[PDB]
Amino acid sequence: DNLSIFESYGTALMEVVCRDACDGHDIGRMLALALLDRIVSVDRQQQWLLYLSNSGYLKVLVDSLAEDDVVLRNLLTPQPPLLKALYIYES
Amino acid sequence: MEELDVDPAETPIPGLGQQNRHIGFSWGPGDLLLYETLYQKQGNSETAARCPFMYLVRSDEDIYSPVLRKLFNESHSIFVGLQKSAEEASGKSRKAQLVQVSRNYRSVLRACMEEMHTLSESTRETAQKYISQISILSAMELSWNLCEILFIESAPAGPLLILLLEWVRLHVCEVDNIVQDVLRSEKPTEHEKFWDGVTGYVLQGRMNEARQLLAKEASTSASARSMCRVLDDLLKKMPMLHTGGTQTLTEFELKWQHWREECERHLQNGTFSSNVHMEAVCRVLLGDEEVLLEKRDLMTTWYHFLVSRLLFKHPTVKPTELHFYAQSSLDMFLAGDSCPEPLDNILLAAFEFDIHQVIKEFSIVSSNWWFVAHLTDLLDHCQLFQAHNLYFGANMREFLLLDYASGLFSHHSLWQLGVDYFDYCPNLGREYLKLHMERIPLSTEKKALKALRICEQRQMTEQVRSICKTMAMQSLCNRRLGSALSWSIRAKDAAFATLISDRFLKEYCERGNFTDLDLIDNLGSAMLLSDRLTFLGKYREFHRMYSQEQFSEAASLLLSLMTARIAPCSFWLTLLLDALPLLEQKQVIFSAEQTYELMRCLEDRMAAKLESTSPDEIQKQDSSIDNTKVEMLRLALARNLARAIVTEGALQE
Amino acid sequence: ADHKDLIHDVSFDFHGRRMATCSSDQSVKVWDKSENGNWHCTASWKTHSGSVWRVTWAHPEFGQVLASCSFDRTAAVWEEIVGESNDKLRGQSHWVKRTTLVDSRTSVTDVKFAPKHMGLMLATCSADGVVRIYEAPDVMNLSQWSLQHEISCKLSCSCISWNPSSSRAHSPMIAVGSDDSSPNIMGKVQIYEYNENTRKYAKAETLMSVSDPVHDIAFAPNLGRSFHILAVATKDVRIFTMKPLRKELSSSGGVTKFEIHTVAQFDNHNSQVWRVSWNITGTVLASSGDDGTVRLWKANYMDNWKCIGVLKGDGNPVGNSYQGF
Amino acid sequence: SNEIPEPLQLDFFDRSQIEQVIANCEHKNRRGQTVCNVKLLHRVLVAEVNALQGMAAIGQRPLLMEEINTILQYVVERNKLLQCLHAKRHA
Amino acid sequence: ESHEAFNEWFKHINSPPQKPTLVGQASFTEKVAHEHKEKKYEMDFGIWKGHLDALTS
Amino acid sequence: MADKFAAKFVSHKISRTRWRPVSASSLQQPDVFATGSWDNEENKVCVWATSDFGATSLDEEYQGDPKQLCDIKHPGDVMDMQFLDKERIVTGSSTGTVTIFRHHENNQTLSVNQRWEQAHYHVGSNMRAPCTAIVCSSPEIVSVGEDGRINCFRAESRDVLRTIDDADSSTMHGVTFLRTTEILTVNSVGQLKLWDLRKQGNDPTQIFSVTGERVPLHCVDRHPNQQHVVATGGQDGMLCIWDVRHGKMPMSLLNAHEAEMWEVHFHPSNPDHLFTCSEDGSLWHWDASADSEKPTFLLGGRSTFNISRSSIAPPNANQSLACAWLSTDPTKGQLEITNLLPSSTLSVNSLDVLGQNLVCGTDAEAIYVTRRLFS
């Protein structure tokens, strides 16, 4: 029922969640990424992933990976940031 | 002039130089003027037609051009469009819009350069100045494209060299000039500059026509078929930015290494030797400095030298070494017979980055405020840390817009972009516009309506009232009473209204002008602001009601007028006289108390009139006639009240 | 003659429409700018019995009233009265003296007008440190006035500066500057404020730092808001910036708390500057004096003033350039 | 329903002048918002409409008094809405 | 259709007639305003009478 | 007549009908206009007053039917006129009789001021030259004929100082403005001629056309503010709307409305509303006169319209148009088709809008007065 309601909604909520996850901060971005992970795990038709790949989000994913690499470099350097960065990298 | 010392007036000849001129200054609508004033020595001034010694002081005279103002209007229109679209979000869309507007700017700049070239071909004497302006515009476009491909994108190794080569081949026409000079000869393939043109095409990157020309040379010369075949087989290993999933520099480095290895193998085997032309071509392609300094007729300037070095020496470079390579290129280019240049230093600074210092150098050297404004807008669109102060105050874009608005108002036409440029500034723009629109003349109807529409779109009131008062006094000087009254009732002012009222009063006292049906046609607040129009309307209503016969309404209107007290004494006399036609009659039911209160009000009004005219005396020239009229009015009033008493006594029967 | 004797005063309109010239020719000349281009001689007539000294137009909220000053201890008021100006026709400009301003026994140094608000505050300064402000009691006639204010300072007079009021709780002040061709008197600039609690002018500020004679003072109006700029032409090039500090809640125009410091000091005349120009908000400054030297300065994107033109007028000219630019 | 408290809102003149007056009348007080005193705001409005005139001003005093009364009723209703919003925030 | 026309006519006749909108102690400007209001009221009354006659027919 | 918008049958040719600024640009509402009696027995200028709804400034009663407040008489003909001043009205004639009338606002009457029987003179007197379109501005009044004859009069004096009579081809109907030294004329085929203030001899200076669609141009008018803004309406639609006055051939092409447009009027108060009439009985209302950048009032027609504010963009990659130069695609937007009357009148001649009231004179000798309700 949840998947049918999501498909009936279409790409509005998908784009909203994607924008909130990309142009976010720390806790909100981590929670949005965890929600995306859970919805991908409970997915069954992969049409959501197909739309994500077709909408041109590859450059945004590359930028997110670069930001994660920058966070990893900051953690490797002395004086680590807050403890939430560990959970962010885990997610 | 603008930095040194100005020269005195008159000619340095003895006759006209025996008497010096202490030139004085004068100010007006922002345009300063110089007048011939005499001091110490004598002078030769007159008072006739035109101005002596053609004194027409005006600044920014070189910017006035038919195509220049059109290009500026188009640029500011697309600038306003960019500011309107800037309310979107951030990301790759902003960079795409920036690239699009930069391409549009380069296109309109190329169009302006073509128009300037056409004007140069049309003219004759100003050809040198037009060529100088064309070169300046080309340098401006080159700097704009360099800033767009360097600061905006800020791409690392890989596509940076390709973008630089594309910009060079798009902004450089020396290769085309060399190709034209080769084609001018009777034998292009047998020309000595054919190999130079081929090397230039290879440097630019266009390999299709390069390989075509190589095949043509192989078909022409009998001792170059296998040579050109080996050259084409070697050029096939060129790296055209491979995309095996993402931006990878390993493939580019491997392709460059394979190309170098194949070239070295051919040179060691001999298939690429034993020929002077191809040997020199290979020596140039290997990456030298003295050979390129000798063959500098092919390359353009320091940026061309730098891109040639980066293409023939390394596969790709990083931004950490790009500035070093550009500095070394400029250094050896200046060493190889050259001279320093301000535009070259500006380009070197742009390559060395630091946006703050490059825009500082731009504002110091070039006085073009629109270019700095566009650069600041692009830097703000790119989402970068910008300075919030103009090294003295605050906000550089506001200062640039104010400078452009001043430079535009210095002219005598086109003042529409200044309105929006002042609306964009929610600080000094309001007072600047309020001071400029009140300082500019508002005499002609065209500019008057223009300023009226401008202030109406800006939604103001003081400027509207000022323009209305100015046009009202203009109409009064030109003898336009109706126009002056319309302007006064538009500005909600009463000075001109009372002036026109007194004009009507003296006109009626002279000849007697009262046919004014404008109040009956249309009304508003003029009848409340003044009293002459109200008096005329009341008189017309009284006349119509007396024609339609209504003594009750006549008495009511008379009481209302006596309680309102309108118009001075010259018309108060007529208002008090207007009672006999309503008193000599005997018909119509009349009430005793109504007649009593009416006669009491009339007597009180006449007593107040006598007291207000003069203390216990009367003036004017109508004395005996006025007394006789008062006596006959009192007699008619007595007869009317007697008839009213008779009617009241007969009604109760 | 024909502008061949001693030049007195030349003035231009703020709208760029009319210009006036007066000298020792016992007559003034008023020229008008053509709508198609350039200008020509429009009219020339006698305004005073002696040598006309000064001439100043009026505010754009009234008309083109000419205030002709001379050494005859009087001041004439002229207005361009039209004749048969009806429909698409312009009548002949008939110069008719409406009224005159006379109440002193010395010559007039300067004259200016006032905006609407109350009426027409006409100021007239004499050659002994006494200014008089007259008000028009009626609006339908320009042949009457009443002396409403008199201010007697020290030394003599020269120029006067006001302030176009447009804001709230603000009154137009009057800035006066004494001069006597002797830089030995301490304090030369005074500022009087129109206190409304007494409905009269009262002392406010007195510049005790400047001691040189003040020939004129150029004021930068800002609608009675923000800051202000005052350019003084003494012996050098002095420009000060007056910044408002705070307003008290007890004095409605009495004592004020203003700060005035030197913000542009430039010495290049080495003589006695007599007149200084004024552009928009301080962009181009031309300073001239009684020594045959004109100094031009421009303000770029900073706040300094660099020498851009040194015009000679006492010796012999060496060339001819930049006469119409 | 949401109770949004508005300090000053005019609609009888130009919107530019209305926004300018609104931006000028922005200061803290005792209620907690950017509102002014019931008499001080009317005094400021009177001073503003007096400092921007010309020479003619007849028949405008009753209109100004009616506008002042309407603005007073408006700010009273907005203060009531502000108390409602404060009680809702406390709840 | 008959019920719709009946409801339209009923609401039209239940709508009270307009008023000239005038008060006592009126000056000249107040008299001009009252005259304008009476003119617009007469126009609205004529329009309403025409509409009511059409709906009744 | 007696219901809805006003409809009167004056039974006369509705030549030039223009609303006077007597009741406009003031506290009073516009209702007084003037009409020329061309193609009749006596060419007389009649000042009339309409009847609008409500009463905001002592308007007329009843439900319509305008009434003639005044009329003037002159032996000359009546072509057209441009309101240079509220009290001054200059009307040309096809027989060389320029009538400058003086209208008294304080009297609501017309007085014969000047009747130039020897108009269009410059090197003598007694000259007769026909006129087609006369337009005034500061400080010149320019009148054009059929064979390229141009006449120029000054606004500060009552005399003629420029009469250029050359030999041109085709027929020119109408004249716009540009500046004080440039004149743009349209042809009855699709040509645009650019002349200067000092032109001698035959052979026109610059002649341009529009590639693609070339229909006969009919009415042409200029903007009351910026002179370089031109509004043209011809056969199948072929106007060159431009916010400037440079370039060789016009790069603008706005082709719409297959029906012939006889007249296109502007809003005199707020020059941002254009009203266009059709030959099949249609009245279109366009907003934003090119220069005014504001949200358009519905699309319609092959035009580029105007741009407004844009916000809320996806984090992906968008675009922002491009750059191109072609004499086929439009460049400046203007036509904003608003469906008001599809097919109600059999024919429509001229129309004029002011403030909120629109008068419309039809070819069947009738006039219609409509109060606008949109914006």
Numbering used by the authors:
A (entry chain T): 1464 to 1554
B (entry chain J): 1 to 653
C (entry chain L): 9 to 333
D (entry chain T): 1190 to 1280
E (entry chain H): 746 to 802
F (entry chain K): 1 to 375
Article, verbatim:
The nuclear pore complex (NPC), one of the largest protein complexes in eukaryotes, serves as a physical gate to regulate nucleocytoplasmic transport. Three scaffold rings, including an inner ring (IR), a cytoplasmic ring (CR) and a nuclear ring (NR), anchored onto the nuclear envelope (NE), provide bases for other functional parts, such as the cytoplasmic filament, nuclear basket, and permeability barrier. In both CR and NR, named the outer rings, the backbones in each subunit are formed by one or two Y-shaped complexes, also known as the Nup84 complex in fungi or the Nup107-160 complex in vertebrates. Here, we determined the 8 Å resolution cryo-electron microscopic (cryo-EM) structure of the outer rings containing nuclear ring (NR) and cytoplasmic ring (CR) from the Xenopus laevis NPC, with local resolutions reaching 4.9 Å.
